[PDB]
Structures are given as structure tokens and as C-alpha cells.
Design an enzyme around this catalytic site. Sequence first.
Site, PDB file in Angstrom:
ATOM      1  N   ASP A 193      55.986  -1.963  62.274  1.00  0.00           N
ATOM      2  CA  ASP A 193      57.362  -2.133  62.717  1.00  0.00           C
ATOM      3  C   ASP A 193      57.423  -3.116  63.877  1.00  0.00           C
ATOM      4  O   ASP A 193      56.748  -2.934  64.894  1.00  0.00           O
ATOM      5  CB  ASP A 193      57.950  -0.785  63.130  1.00  0.00           C
ATOM      6  N   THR A 206      63.595  -5.468  61.933  1.00  0.00           N
ATOM      7  CA  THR A 206      63.258  -5.736  63.325  1.00  0.00           C
ATOM      8  C   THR A 206      62.272  -6.886  63.473  1.00  0.00           C
ATOM      9  O   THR A 206      62.164  -7.456  64.563  1.00  0.00           O
ATOM     10  CB  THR A 206      62.683  -4.482  63.977  1.00  0.00           C
ATOM     11  N   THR A 207      61.549  -7.234  62.410  1.00  0.00           N
ATOM     12  CA  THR A 207      60.632  -8.366  62.448  1.00  0.00           C
ATOM     13  C   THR A 207      61.304  -9.665  62.029  1.00  0.00           C
ATOM     14  O   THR A 207      60.942 -10.734  62.534  1.00  0.00           O
ATOM     15  CB  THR A 207      59.425  -8.093  61.546  1.00  0.00           C
ATOM     16  N   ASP A 265      62.647   4.299  59.089  1.00  0.00           N
ATOM     17  CA  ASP A 265      63.217   3.061  58.566  1.00  0.00           C
ATOM     18  C   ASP A 265      63.944   3.303  57.249  1.00  0.00           C
ATOM     19  O   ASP A 265      65.053   2.795  57.037  1.00  0.00           O
ATOM     20  CB  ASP A 265      62.119   2.015  58.381  1.00  0.00           C
TER      21      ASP A 265
HETATM   22  N1  LIG Z   1      58.568  -6.411  46.527  1.00  0.00           N
HETATM   23  C1  LIG Z   1      58.897  -7.457  47.319  1.00  0.00           C
HETATM   24  N2  LIG Z   1      58.856  -8.724  46.855  1.00  0.00           N
HETATM   25  C2  LIG Z   1      59.180  -9.772  47.632  1.00  0.00           C
HETATM   26  N3  LIG Z   1      59.567  -9.658  48.912  1.00  0.00           N
HETATM   27  C3  LIG Z   1      59.655  -8.446  49.507  1.00  0.00           C
HETATM   28  C4  LIG Z   1      59.316  -7.251  48.725  1.00  0.00           C
HETATM   29  N4  LIG Z   1      59.482  -6.197  49.542  1.00  0.00           N
HETATM   30  C5  LIG Z   1      59.891  -6.675  50.744  1.00  0.00           C
HETATM   31  N5  LIG Z   1      59.989  -8.016  50.723  1.00  0.00           N
HETATM   32  C6  LIG Z   1      60.413  -8.877  51.853  1.00  0.00           C
HETATM   33  O1  LIG Z   1      59.618  -8.654  53.017  1.00  0.00           O
HETATM   34  C7  LIG Z   1      60.422  -8.882  54.177  1.00  0.00           C
HETATM   35  C8  LIG Z   1      59.964  -8.016  55.343  1.00  0.00           C
HETATM   36  O2  LIG Z   1      60.377  -6.666  55.154  1.00  0.00           O
HETATM   37  P1  LIG Z   1      59.750  -5.486  56.052  1.00  0.00           P
HETATM   38  O3  LIG Z   1      58.396  -5.940  56.541  1.00  0.00           O
HETATM   39  O4  LIG Z   1      59.848  -4.213  55.248  1.00  0.00           O
HETATM   40  O5  LIG Z   1      60.746  -5.320  57.307  1.00  0.00           O
HETATM   41  P2  LIG Z   1      61.063  -6.508  58.342  1.00  0.00           P
HETATM   42  O6  LIG Z   1      62.169  -7.287  57.678  1.00  0.00           O
HETATM   43  O7  LIG Z   1      61.464  -5.778  59.598  1.00  0.00           O
HETATM   44  O8  LIG Z   1      59.760  -7.254  58.460  1.00  0.00           O
HETATM   45  C9  LIG Z   1      61.858  -8.601  53.767  1.00  0.00           C
HETATM   46  O9  LIG Z   1      62.703  -9.668  54.203  1.00  0.00           O
HETATM   47  C10 LIG Z   1      61.840  -8.553  52.254  1.00  0.00           C
HETATM   48  O10 LIG Z   1      62.737  -9.529  51.723  1.00  0.00           O
END
Ligand SMILES: Nc1ncnc2c1ncn2[C@@H]1O[C@H](COP(=O)(O)OP(=O)(O)O)[C@@H](O)[C@H]1O
Lengths: 364, 105, 526, 535, 94, 34, 75, 147, 55
Positions: free
Chosen positions: D72, D105-106, D403
Site C-alpha cells: 500500500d 494511493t500509489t 482496501d
Molecule cells: N489484472 C490486471 N491487469 C492489468 N492491470 C491491472 C490488473 N489489476 C490491477 N491493475 C492495475 O494496477 C494498478 C495499480 O493498482 P493497485 O496496486 O492495486 O493499487 P494502486 O493504484 O494504489 O497502486 C491499477 O491502476 C490497475 O489499473
Amino acid sequence: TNDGATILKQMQVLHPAARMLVELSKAQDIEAGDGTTSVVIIAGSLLDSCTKLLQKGIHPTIISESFQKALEKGIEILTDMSRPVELSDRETLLNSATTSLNSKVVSQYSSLLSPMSVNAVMKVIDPATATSVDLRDIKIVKKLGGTIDDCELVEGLVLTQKVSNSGITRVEKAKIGLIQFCLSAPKTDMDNQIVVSDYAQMDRVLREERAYILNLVKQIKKTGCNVLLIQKSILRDALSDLALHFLNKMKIMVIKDIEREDIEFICKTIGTKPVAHIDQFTADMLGSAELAEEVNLNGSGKLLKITGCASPGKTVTIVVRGSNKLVIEEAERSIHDALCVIRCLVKKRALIAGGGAPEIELAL
Amino acid sequence: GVAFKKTFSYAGFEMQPKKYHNPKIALLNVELELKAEKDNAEIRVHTVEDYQAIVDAEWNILYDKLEKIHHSGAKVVLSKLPIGDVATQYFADRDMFCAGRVPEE
Amino acid sequence: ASLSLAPVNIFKAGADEERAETARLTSFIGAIAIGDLVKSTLGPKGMDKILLSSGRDASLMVTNDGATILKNIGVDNPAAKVLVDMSRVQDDEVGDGTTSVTVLAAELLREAESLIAKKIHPQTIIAGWREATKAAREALLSSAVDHGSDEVKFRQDLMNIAGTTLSSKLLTHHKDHFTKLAVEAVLRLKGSGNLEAIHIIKKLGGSLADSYLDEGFLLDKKIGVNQPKRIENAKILIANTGMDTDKIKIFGSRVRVDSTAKVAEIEHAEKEKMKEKVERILKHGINCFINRQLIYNYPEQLFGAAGVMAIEHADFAGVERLALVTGGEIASTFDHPELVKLGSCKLIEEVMIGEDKLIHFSGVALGEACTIVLRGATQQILDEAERSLHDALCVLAQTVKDSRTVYGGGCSEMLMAHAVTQLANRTPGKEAVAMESYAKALRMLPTIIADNAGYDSADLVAQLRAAHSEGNTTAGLDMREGTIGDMAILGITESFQVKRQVLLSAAEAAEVILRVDNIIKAAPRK
Amino acid sequence: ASMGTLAFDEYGRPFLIIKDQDRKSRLMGLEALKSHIMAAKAVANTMRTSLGPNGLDKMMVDKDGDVTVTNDGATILSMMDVDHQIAKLMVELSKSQDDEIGDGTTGVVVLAGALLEEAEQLLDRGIHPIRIADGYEQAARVAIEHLDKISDSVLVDIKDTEPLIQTAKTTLGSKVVNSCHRQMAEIAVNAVLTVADMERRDVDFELIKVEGKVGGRLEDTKLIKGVIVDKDFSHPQMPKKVEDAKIAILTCPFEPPKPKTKHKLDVTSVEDYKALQKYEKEKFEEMIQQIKETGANLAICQWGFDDEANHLLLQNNLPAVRWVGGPEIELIAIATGGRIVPRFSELTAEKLGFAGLVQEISFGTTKDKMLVIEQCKNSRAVTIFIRGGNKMIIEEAKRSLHDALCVIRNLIRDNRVVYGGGAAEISCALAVSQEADKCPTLEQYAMRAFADALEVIPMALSENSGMNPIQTMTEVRARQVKEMNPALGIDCLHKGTNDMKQQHVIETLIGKKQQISLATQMVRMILKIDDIRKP
Amino acid sequence: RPVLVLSQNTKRESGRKVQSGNINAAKTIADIIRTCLGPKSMMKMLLDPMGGIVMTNDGNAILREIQVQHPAAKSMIEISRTQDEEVGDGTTSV
Amino acid sequence: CALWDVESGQLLQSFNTFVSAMVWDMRSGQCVQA
Amino acid sequence: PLSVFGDRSTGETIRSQNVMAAASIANIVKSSLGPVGLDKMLVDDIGDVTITNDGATILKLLEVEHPAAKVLCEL
Amino acid sequence: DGMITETKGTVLIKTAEELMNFSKGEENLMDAQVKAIADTGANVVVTGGKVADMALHYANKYNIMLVRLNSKWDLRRLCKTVGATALPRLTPPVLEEMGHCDSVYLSEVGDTQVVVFKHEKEDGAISTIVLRGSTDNLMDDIERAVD
Amino acid sequence: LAGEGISVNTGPKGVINDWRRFKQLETEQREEQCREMERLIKKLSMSGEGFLDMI
Ligand SMILES: Nc1ncnc2c1ncn2[C@@H]1O[C@H](COP(=O)(O)OP(=O)(O)O)[C@@H](O)[C@H]1O
Ligand SMILES: Nc1ncnc2c1ncn2[C@@H]1O[C@H](COP(=O)(O)OP(=O)(O)O)[C@@H](O)[C@H]1O
Ligand SMILES: Nc1ncnc2c1ncn2[C@@H]1O[C@H](COP(=O)(O)OP(=O)(O)O)[C@@H](O)[C@H]1O
Ligand SMILES: [Mg+2]
Ligand SMILES: [Mg+2]
Ligand SMILES: [Mg+2]
Ligand SMILES: [Mg+2]
């Protein structure tokens, strides 16, 4: 000291192997009480041999298994050499005590301490039934002054506390009684206060307090008691000055500040049942004794000795005397070693020769 | 209107309703909880009946204050002084909102 | 640009951070150091360790338990902290497998370091490890054998499990006697999982073979003064009352009178209240009375005059154990004697153990509470024996709860690794390499087992792999002579729960650590 | 470029203006802007590696040596020990995104870093930072309008929870719980839906208890439609399992009553003492009888009780638990449908709660017990019980579940969603670029820099998955332009398709809008600052 | 690290203070030997730094043995020396 | 911390309520409220 | 970023410092201009006394640190 | 506030009725005292000590303006200006002790909240000069000039 | 406790300012120490900057 366990415990060894050897000596002292020096030497020699054995290329597990086999064979050999012993044979017990006392500082005094130790052990156990000896039933009192030749075995009870009475220091045909309550002004366990609103109430309080104390002392005296032992008390005055004066007026010896942990020993010694409330204080609670006097140790202190009891139940006291602190401490340790030797003889009725004979035969 | 942050709700607060459509608001400066009647007050009794009467009197004082508030017709209660857990549960039983230790402004 | 490798400084004084390669290096070094430390204490031929405290106490501890070793070390590397916490949680869940899980995690992280050196993304390694863990868990579950329905077979399984658990520890000298002791102690629990009901008493002196399980119960408390020291066909009453200046709960109450005569009368009233309470207690018709709290001189004297034993200051554990072993009910009120159950035992007497006196309860009614007397030569020996018995009792209780068992001596690791290799042989990509590394660590586990014994680990592991690939699913290491043999015949069995927990925890910790690519440290207090 | 200004007058006389002016520092204008942009770039580059399903964790160690492994961004930046003021601003931005949304948050940190990095090269070309901020604001408004345009709505009905499960899975994919991914998403969805005011109102997170215990496995994590309490039955001999329990929640310790006012009770005679003793005994018997008369099976207290009450409770077949916390008391009352009673005299049958099963749970060879209440009639409060192989993954699972719950809460508040994987931001960059071609030339540079900064997150996702960033992003953008589909993103998981609608990568529209808005405002502040006066 | 125009050990004073100080220095120098003029003058003992003793009432002899820090006093000493060298008398008077 | 009986002088138990915050309860030996 | 082992002044700061140094040098000797001007006394660290009205002598005897002040003195 | 004994005040309760009625009686006494003060026509009350919560509530109930002056010199000067007498107890004031002012109100000057006791006649024992300015030092100089 | 080959690498070139400042201060103390050591021990057995730059 000559005691191996005490020598190992006193010096603060730092290496873990040395600490383990110290624990080994302590365990040997606990189980046996003698041989605390021999066992450490045996372990050291065993490990010294293990050095050469490991240098030859032998795994430690094989060494340990072989040592276990050798230990079993050695136990068999030691059992084979030994001979049965009877607790009725005083000569064997005296010889064991003398052998235990040969290596200690009190070796010229062995002719006095060996029969003393044997009698002390035999007076606290049943020879025909007992399978073990409780050495906590043999009280040892260390008083400075004199020489080790002045050590004496008291068949009764010896108290280090001093008599609160003045002019009463010797009672014959005593009727001793333990008190676990306080001879002072009444004081409930709840928060209690006395409120005075009139002038006469003050002298009423004084008169009634005096009457209460006098009634307590009269109830104590009516049972025929003449020697009173008062348990140590906190949060309440155990012995009031008025109570002490009243007891003195009735010719009753008073000893106070009796330790709580010593109640059981006193009860076992003089056959006195402790009393916690004056309602149940009766004649049957008292413990009869032939003499209860306070003796003076030639200016080195005073001891209260109660010798001669109608019910002398399996308890003795030993008074150890000497010149300085170190010699009396070592005499106490040596006497304890002799008592432990007799205890071992009681536990296992088997005797073996000494002077290195078992070790030589075992090695061969 | 007016809006302010939630101020350290006691136990049983989440059991109160959180929306009203025409509430009457009791703006108070009162400590609604069991406590000593006065800092220098002292109670002297010599009978167990008086002891029970005293404890029941304390509870009755608190419940009388709460009962007066309840029959005042108000549904929202605000106070400068703390509102205890007993009062919070009492107001929850009557379906009212309570909030103690509200700032003066 | 890096957070720390920039012209501008973004940290407090003392704060630090390590980027990808440095964080991976530090984590791998810490994990490998922890694994190498905990290993060599693994298997029947494992050796013990000496733990010296640097504090003022300077406590000395000799142990073979992996969790005990990992607890009493000051680890700075955070990955070492991860492994230590994993071992502690493994110890909490089950009594055994701490060394195994730590070594498995260390080997997995070493293989991960090799794969990273081979330019493989850590996510690929994690996915391959998840697939390998699924396959290995499925194979281990499929290989489990249950004997709960049978009685004598379940007893034999308990014997084998206790022996296998005690094989590595110091108790292996008297393994048979101690295994019988532990299995009897566990079976006396009547299926209850309460391991607090089994009390271990460490008494110095005597031989290790002198340790025994008392047929009744032993208490380390003292009897009153005038009370009897021996009672036959005792009627037990276990209580948790005051018995010590018992004051009315009204704390605002006080005594306020105008004379000392009234004070004396109130004193007599208090004494009469205590006497009435003792009379109510005696109305139950009892010979012995155990109270959790203290008993002052007046109730003690009353009990002595009544000829009733009054054991005082028996703590919560003590009264619970007495209730479990005698069937009595811990009562705090005595207005309804007919509604309180009384414990029973054939005889109560004092015993002479070493130089200390204890109260012996013989011929107990229920007996669902055990006391174990441990006699040893040193304090370290006693502590290690206590820890070994704790491990054995925990594993036996887990087996009683779940009777599924798996074969030990590396057989389970070989079977799981064979399943993982079979899965990897049908998977394309670098996930196959990751799963092969997983199987390599699983092989490395019994390799360390054999290395600790001094045998040729490579040849033995090759033979085990060949046997498991052929179809001999019960082949395992035979530490008696250094060959391989049938684990079912040799009776080397282990709890399925322990092995599954070891596998899952090791895989989970390895996955958690592998995901890290940056270690940021705040400025310490010192 | 430091130590303020030192003159000491032109007449040689002392010239002191600001206290400790010789021990203070100062940066003016463009140098301060460059330093701030560099600091923000460093923070964003540190954060960007933990973006996406393939993002890696950060292992944070506090000042006491406690180490936390997490993904996170808000948690990482909160524990980070920074001293640069712009780094603190970035941490506060991430915390604000966490507070408002709970997810993304990232993304905010990376977006702000990219925006400031582009603003650096705009500043090098001689553009006033206020102009850059205005252009960024205009482009952010355009992007928000485009997000609203390309948004899609989902059903938030209890009967069909598939879109909610998909959204929770998308949220949880980047976390370590992706092994139990679907079960965790189901748990979060059910937990939010069970306790939520149905009329699109708030979701009270205080009614969701998240407690974790070591041991077991991650898959052992379960949703309890009741309350789990770490206490246990007071007397060790009461039954460990009660069925169809009638709960009696009480806040009065089972002790004789005590006035709050300073009080003294006077005992003046023996009969007074006897009356006091009888009163105490009768008070105990009376409280026990009052509890029993309501027909209750289990009694729960908050302030504990003494030995006589315990033995009377055991004797009357009344299991009881003591020293239950206030929040736990409230949760039990809410779940069981029973009221909180302050004293025995006010305890009636109608105030009794109901529980289908009250049980005591053991946890292996740990001696620690824990009480669980479940199978309530219409329990409005739920608790999540997390198990794991170590406390570290337990904390990580706790924050991952938080989350997921926050994401489902945002779905409750607003049901419009956009497809993630960088597809939404690529479409926003395309819209911003199209809008820039029509505006006057001066703001074109700021708007195109905004578009370039928007396009970094798909590049970060492609780089974290090992693919070539520029080539993949260019191909996806070209496909989006050619075939009108704003759902084409970065195939991080290598599923063989670029359409996020089929891959079910779903993001809340509120989250993206908050990300863009907060990043724009923080970038505006950082651009506006041109003076530092650190001591 | 201070930036300076002149040296850190250079002191400047100017204005009425400088004139007052110079005139006061001259007045004090005059007061030193004020009583050593005329037929009824008194002797003065001067302790030489090299351990010697100078016992005289000559103005130049007295002023020559005095070490002063204020530069105006140095100017007055030079004036006395010049008067002594030029004519050999009138040092106290000048 | 440990609780000692003033009168008898025996160790009651080592850890109606006392708080060190961290409150305990010697009536049961538990750690009650944290 | 520069990583130059020294202090740097840029923009208005250095210009203001140079002007202040030049103005200080001017104000040093502004009181000895024209027939109504007055002389100055220069005292060394060893007690040597110099009384003069000439600007060049005054600027030569003084210790000067700032480069612009050095420029004016050499002028 | 309700006056208390100077020796020591200890509320002694022996029955439940006294505990029930003590607070009610105290509040009724406060209300009676405040209403008696108000019945004389005193619509402004100035006190030199603290103000009790119940007293303030009952003063607000009867529309009474409350001003608290900690300084005793300020109290004496206010008594001189208005023409009242500082009562030692909380008894209602007789007509000779009742001060009169032509306008009393709360006002803000600049960024300072002030209370003004303003007379309309060109008389009174005390006259006040209000000084404005931009700097505290300048205003102090103006005060010195006025002195 | 491994990685004895630290190879600090970019560190010394990235924090060279403080290192050189400390080196300059230590060398400044070094001339004074060398000047004063010529008197002590060498002959004893058998502002400071003003003295230094005067010598
Ligand atoms: N299965 C997936 N395929 C492609 N992109 C993904 C998938 N799951 C999440 N993402 C992308 O990863 C990014 C980071 O999400 P996450 O790490 O969960 O939270 P944060 O946005 O706080 O980093 C998101 O913007 C999302 O679009
Ligand atoms: N009179 C004696 N003659 C020969 N050997 C003796 C004699 N007395 C004691 N020993 C031997 O000395 C050894 C040491 O005994 P001692 O020093 O008394 O206690 P420990 O065995 O603890 O050292 C014993 O094993 C005993 O056999
Ligand atoms: N008699 C035996 N023969 C072969 N292997 C054994 C034997 N006893 C134990 N092992 C092996 O030793 C491994 C470790 O067991 P142990 O060291 O006792 O506890 P831990 O699992 O905590 O390390 C187990 O995986 C088991 O397979
Ligand atoms: Mg000997
Ligand atoms: Mg094991
Ligand atoms: Mg996310
Ligand atoms: Mg002359």
C-alpha cells in the site's frame, strides 16, 4: 570450605561447561550430599579422555553410547562389590560418619560429631519403616564463642529469641502455648474508630481497654499455662506493654516475635497446637515440658532451650559453636554432609569400601 | 446550518438512528452520567436499607434527568459536558441521537 | 533516480534505504544465515546448541528446538525477523517442524537467489512456487493414511509418532521409555486438547531414566499445622474463597462506636462469621479442602480441630488440575451442599522427591490431569527434557485431534518433490525452472538430514529419488545404518498436520520475502 | 544560494535582521523549483515499482526495529522517515487519497511525480509555473469530463454480486492475498453488503471488525456473521458451547452496589454486622435470581465480577463472560438484537439478545481461547477473522481487506466504473491531446505535458510486467485510436488480450477522479512554492 | 563562513567621538606632567621595563618612558621629543 | 509485577483492580482491558 | 547537483553585494573630499600611526577582502 | 455564584430524600436570587469574580447582560463612571447603589472585541480616550504625549 | 554478516563535499599539530592561526 559443591557455586565460573559442571555438583549434593567433589573430577577425566577419542576420528554419538554401556557395566560392578547393611548396626553408621568427616576441617572433632550426627538422624526417623530422611527436621543453630568441642545435641527446642519478661528466666514443669493473635487493644479487620463526644468517654475507653487486656491475660492464665510463645505480627502490636505487665504479674514467661515459618517445627517439637482465637485457648492446646530456661553462652549471647517433652516427636536441634565465623560455617557444612551420608545409607541399604577401592576395581 | 465532527461516542451509540426528518434539538450544558452529587458531598448512613436507598436515589436522579429530556420532546441531545454510557444507552432505547463534549463554539 | 542516490537528500539523520539488488542481497544473506544456523540441529543425528545471554542474568540454555534457538537471538536483518516469526507461529500451531520449516524457507530463498541471478522475474518465480505448492499439497494429502477407526493400530501410530518426534532430541537415549510416558500422558487426557492439564515437574538429581508419570497427581503445596498428613478415601472439596480476613465487599463500610467493648464485640462477630463459614464448608462432609487463595491461622486451626486437610494457595492452574483429576467442582459459596460435586481419591499423603516434599493424590477418580516428574543431572538437561516432552505432547495431541499420518524420514519430501517435478515436466516457460528449484529445495531437506548423520547424502538422495520415481512411495531414509528402506515397516511416521503446516508456512514466507525489492529503515531510537 | 543575505552594512556597523540568520538557509525561485521537482521525482520513482499486479513489496522498518512488508502506497509513505518538505507533502497526498477513497494511493504519487517531471522541462523553456499549473488544471478538467463520458454503470444489488466481486478482485490483484483472491473478494463484498444502509447511504466501517490471529492458513480466513471476542468463559467448568443462547448484555459488575458519591457506612453493633453480611449475601442471590428469571442462557458483562457471582452463575447453569470491551459489547448488542442493560433491576426478557451458537475456540498448542458468536437472526454487524503463517502477512491481509472494503464502499456511494489496466488513462491522454490541438498554442505545451504525465502509469504497468513500455503503450494507444474502444489497456497478466472488459479489470470512477484531482492540486501547490526558509 | 568587505579585525570610529577622544588624550598627557613645571617642581620615579629607575622632572624624560595606546598620546610624545631635540628645553611648557 | 500479602508475607500471584496504561485483575489473573 | 566545493551567489544577491562593497569603499573616504574635508588616522596592529587625507594611501593601507572593493582600491 | 462558608463546606447526606433534593434546592435558590436581582430593573450585571454556569443560565433566561472585570482597579473605575456601589454579597441593589449608563453594548473596533459603557451627557467622573494607529510603538508614543 | 566486499562505489563521490570539508578542517588542525610537536617531546624530554601563518 572443602565442599566441592560450595567451592564450585561460590566462584563465578563463566564457561558454559563449567556452569554445567557446577549444576552437576549441585545435583549430586541434592541426590546424595557427599561425593560432590568426586563427581566433578570424574566428569572432567571423562571429557579429557573424550579429547583423545575425538582426535582419533570417532563420532561423539558413538562415544556417548559406549560411555552409557560402560556406565551400565560400572553400576553392575559397584552393586556386586557392595554389601547389605542394617540400620540397627551403630558401628557401621559411626564408621560412615567418620569417613564422611575425615576430609573436612572437623576431623579431630570426629569423635564428637560422628555419634552426634548418627543420633540426630536416628532420632527423626523410624528405623523399621522409613525409606527416606527429611533433613529439614534437624535444626542447626550457629552460635559464636567457645570451640567446636562445645557442639551439643538438644533433644528439645532451641529458640534464638529473647524472653521479654524480666526476672523470669527459668520455668520447671512448663505448659507452653503458641499464640497466633495479638494481646493488645481490640482492632477489627474492618476500618474501626472510636468516637469520643463526652469527657467521661475517655476514661471509659481507658478502663475498658484495661479490662479487655486483663480478661485476655486471665483467660490465658486460667489454663495453667506458664510459658507463652507469641507469633510475630505486623499491622497490629502483638504484645502490648499493659499485656506484658499483666503477664509478668502472673509469673508467665513470654517470648514474642516467633517466625511464621517456624510454627510447624515448634508444634512438631514440643507438641503444642497453635491457637488463633482466645475462645479456643484451652489446656489441651498446651505442650508440657520438663524445663524451659534461657542459658547464657559465656557472654557470646543467650539461647532459650526447652529440654524434656512429654511428646518428643521426631525432631532434634544441633548447636554448633566455634571461634570465628568461617570455622562454624565449615562445621555446619561438614555436619550436613555427615547427615546426608546417613540419609543415603537409610535410602539404600548397601555399603561399599572406600579409599579409592571402588574406582580401582571399576577401572580394572 | 452547522456541522461538527463526531466527539468520542460511548458504547451503544451505534444503536442510535443517524437521520431525522424534523428533529427537536436539546442544546444543554449538563453532565449526564452517574457521578458524585458534589465534590465535597459526603453520605453517612448506618443501615443497609439506607445504603440501597442511596444507590437507588443516585440512579433515580440520573433517570429523572433523562426522563425530563425524553418528555421534552427532543430527538437530538447535545451537551458541553460529557454524556455517559448509561445516558447513551438510555437515548438509544428511545431512538434519539446524543453527543457529549461538543465544543462551545 | 534513486531515493538516496540523488544530489538532494530526502531522509532524516540515520534513515537509510536499499534498492533492488541491495535489498535482495541483504534479505537473502539474512535468510541463508538463519537457515544455516538452525540447520545441523535437524534429524535424528542433529546436535544441540548453547545460548549465552549477554544480560546481567547471563542465563545458560542448551537446546535443540529450532524455535527456542531463533527466539533468543538478536537479529537485525528484517528477513531474519520474518523467518523467526514464521518459526514462532509454527511452534504455536504445532509442537514440531520449526527447524524443518526454517530450513525449507532458507533453501527456497537460496534457490530464488539462483533464479534471480539467472535473470528471472520474481513474479514468475512466485507463480511457479504457487503451482508447486498446490501440487505438493495435493500429493501429500493423497498420501495421508488414517488409522483413527482402529484402536490398536492408532495406539501403534501414536507410539511411532512420539518416537519420531523424540528421536532428534536429547531424550533419544531413553526414547522408548519417554515415548511410552508421553503416549500414556496424552491418552490420559480422554481426548481433551488441554495441554495445561499435563504438569511437568523438574526436580534436580537422579538419572534421566528415573523420570516417570505419576499414576495420580502431585501438588507442590503445604498442608496446615494441626491438620492430618495422610487421609484414605478422601472426599475432596475444591474452593476459591477468601479464607483470609474475609471482608464484606461493601468498601464504604466502617466500624464507628463509642467504646472499646463494642470493638471487641465486633471482633468476636468477625471471628464468629469465619467460624460459621468454616462450619458451612464442613457441612459438605469432607476430609480434604483445597483453596485457591490463602488460609489464615483461624480457619487453619478450625480445620485442624475438625481433622480436615486444608491445602492453601493452590493457584488457578492447581485448582483446575485438581478438579480435572478428582472430578470436584470449584465452589465459592457453600449455602447449597447438595449442588456441589466432591472429588475423590484412594489416598492422600506426602512424598519425598529429592529434598522436597510434595502432596501425592493416589487412586484418583477421573484422572484427566497428569503430572510428570523429571529427574536430571543439570538444570539445562531438565529444561531440554521439558521442551522435548512438550514437543512430543503437542504432536500427540494434534494426532489425537486429527488422526491422519504421513511417513517421515524424508519420504514425504521425496513424494512432494516428485509430484512437483512431474508437474514441472509438463509446463513450458521459466515456471518449470522455478518449480524445479522448489523440488530441489525439497530434496535438499533430507539431504541435510543425511548430512547431519555423516552419511553420503548425495547417493542416498539419488536412491530415494529413483525409488520414488519408480513407484516405491514409502521409501525413506534409514538412519539406523545409513541405507534406505520402507518407512511403513520401520515405523517412522509423522502427523499429516505438522508436515502440511511446515510446507505451507515455508512456501508462504518465501513468497512474502521474495516480493520485497526495497528495504527502508527509519532512524532508530538509539 | 544559501545562508540568506549577509551585508554587515556599508558603514561597517552590525546588520542583524532575522534571529539566527547565519544559521538559516534560503532558496530562491527556479533553484527551489528544481529541488522540489527532483525530490518529488525521487519519491514517485521509489513508489512506481510497486504499481500493478506485478508490483513488488516494500519492507519497512520502524525506529524500534519492527518490520512491515506492504504494497500500500499510503502505508509505505506513512512509515517512511523523510525530512524534505516536498516528500512530506507527497506523503500527505497519498494519505489524503487513502482517506477519501482507500485505493489508488500509489497512483497519485506516480502521477504527481510525472506531472512535476514534465513541468521541469516546461520550466526550462521559459514558462511561468503559474501558467503550467493553469494548463494542468484545464487538462485535468478535460480528463475528468472524459472519464465521466466513458464511465460505465454496474448493478449493486445483493441478489447479483458478480460485478462487485470483479471490482474487489481487481483491487486485491496487486496484493499478496491474490492466492486466495476470489475468496478474499467474496468475503469483502459480503462484509460490506451485510452492514450497509441500503438507501445509498454511508457504510459504517466501525461495524466491521477485522481481527487476525496467527496460525492456520490464509485460506482459513472467513467472514463471521456475528461477533468474535478474545475473551472466554469466566469459570473453567462451564460448558464451552451454547446453542440457541439468549444473551443478557450487562454493564453492571456482579458486585454489591456502590454509590458514586463519597459515602461511609457505619457499623455500630453486632446486629449491624450481621445485617450487613446478610445484605451482601442476599444481594448476590438477588442479582443471580434476577438474571435467571428472564430466561437467559448466556450473560455477558463488561466490568467483571467476583468469586461468589462466578460460582452462582456456574451453579445455575448460566454460562457467562466478563471484562468484555465496550466496542465488543456494542457489537454483540447490535448483532444479537438485544439491548444493553445498565443494572439487573432493569433486565427483562424483551431486552435479551439471541445467538444461534456461542462457542469457545482453541488455537492449537497455545493455551489462548477466544469466544465466537454467530448464527444470529438478522445480524447487522460482521467480523472478519484472518489467519496466516506469520503476523506480517496478517497485517498485509488486514490492509488489503481494508482496501477491498473501501472499494466496495465507493461502489455503494457511486455505481459508475471505468476499466483499469491503464486503458482509462490512455483514453484520457488521447482526449487531452485532442483538446490541446484546438486551444491556443501557449497552453498546448502544458496540456501535452499533462497527457504525457498521464501516460506514465500504463508505462509503469508494462515495465513491471517485463514488457517494453514505449512499444506496448504506443501499440495500445494506436489500437484505441483505430477501433473506438477505451477499454484497451496493458496486458499485465499476459492473458493474451488487451480488452480489459473481457479481463474484468474494473475501477471505480470516483477513485480515478479523486486521483487526478488530488494530483493536480498538489502539483499546483508544489509549482507555486518558490522560497524555502529552513533553519 | 562570513562575507566581508574589510577584515574581521578592523575597527572604525568617526564623528564627534574621535575629536573628543583625541582632545581628551592630549589633555591627559598634559595632566601627566602638569605639576613638573617651574622652580618648585617635584621629582617623579619611573620604573624602566628593563629594571632600571628613572628619577627626574624633565618633561621629555618623563614622557619618553610612558607607553600609550591612544595614537593622540603618541603624537604628543613625538611632539615632546621634537621639542627636546630642536632646542633642549620647554618640553613641559609645549 | 507481583502482589504480596502484607500480613502473611507470601507471594500471592505475579503478573480489586490495579493499572500500571495496562490494567489487571487479581480476582482472575487475566490481563482484562489493555 | 553542481557538486562544486564552494559557495555560489547568483542574480540580485551578487550584484547587491558588489554594490554594497563599492559603496562601503566610497563611504570610507567620502569624508576627505574638498577643502572642508578632514583627515583620517590609520593605526596598524603594531601601533604604527598614519595620518593622511590622500585616498590612494588610505585604500592601500586598509585590508580589503571583497573583489569589487579590491577593484576600487586598484582603481 | 452562591456564596459558601469560609471555614469549610461539607454537604452531609443521611437520607435518600436529601440526596434527591439537594441539587434542585440549590438551583432553585440560584434562580430566586437571580430573579430577585432582575426584579429591581438591573438589566446589566458586572462582577469581579468568576461566573457560575447556573447563574449564567438564569441571567440569560432573564435577559441580563454579564460583564466580568478581573482587575479591581477597573471595577472601581467603572463604579466611579456609572455611579454604582460594589456590593459585597449577591443581594439585589437598592436605588442608591444602582448605577445608570445611557448605553452599554458589545462592539468590535478594528479586530478587537470591546465592551463600551457610553454616556451621552458631557459629564461623568471618568473619560476614556480611544487611540488608533498602525504600530504599537507609535500608539505608546501618542499615549505618552496624552499623558 | 556477509558482503565484506562493500565497494561503496558512488557514495564517496556523492558525499564528497562533507568529506572534503572535514579533510580541510583536519589538515588545518594538522599544520598546528605539526608546528607544536616540534617543541614537545623533541626538546621537552631532553590566535593559533596567526602564529601558523607568521611562521
Ligand atoms: N489484472 C490486471 N491487469 C492489468 N492491470 C491491472 C490488473 N489489476 C490491477 N491493475 C492495475 O494496477 C494498478 C495499480 O493498482 P493497485 O496496486 O492495486 O493499487 P494502486 O493504484 O494504489 O497502486 C491499477 O491502476 C490497475 O489499473
Ligand atoms: N580415612 C580415609 N582413608 C582413605 N580414603 C579416604 C578416607 N576418608 C575419605 N577417603 C576418600 O576420599 C574421597 C573424598 O571424600 P570427601 O573429600 O570426604 O568427599 P568428596 O567425595 O565430596 O570429595 C572419598 O571417595 C573417600 O573414599
Ligand atoms: N528415526 C528417524 N528416522 C529418519 N528420520 C527421522 C527420524 N526421526 C525424525 N526424522 C526426521 O527428522 C526431521 C526433523 O524432525 P525433528 O528434528 O525431530 O523436529 P523438527 O521437525 O522440529 O526439526 C523430520 O522431518 C523427520 O522426517
Ligand atoms: Mg565426602
Ligand atoms: Mg521434532
Ligand atoms: Mg489498488
Ligand atoms: Mg626647562
